[PDB]
């Protein structure tokens, strides 16, 4: 049973380590791009507010 579980762990770790490195890279990229998207939306909201204030004034 010990040999069996050892095989099982060798299998999972390799897999889970690979998948978790991939997931860490993907999640860092996703969070960074979400931050960029929020920044772009904020800048566009500022542009819209500026256009609105110039038009109203």
């Amino acid at each position: 049973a010990e040999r069996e579980a050892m095989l099982a762990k060798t299998a999972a770790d390799n897999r889970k380590s690979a998948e978790q490195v991939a997931a860490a890279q993907a999640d860092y990229e996703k969070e960074m791009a979400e931050a960029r998207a929020q920044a772009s939306a904020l800048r566009d909201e500022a542009r819209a507010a500026g256009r609105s204030v110039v038009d109203e004034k």
Binding site: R3, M6, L7, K9, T10, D13, N14, S17
Partner: peptide
């Protein structure tokens, strides 16, 4: 070989 395999399993757990 079994020794080597246990070793590999340990390294993989570390990874």
């Amino acid at each position: 070989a079994v020794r080597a395999a246990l070793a590999e399993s340990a390294e993989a757990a570390k990874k």
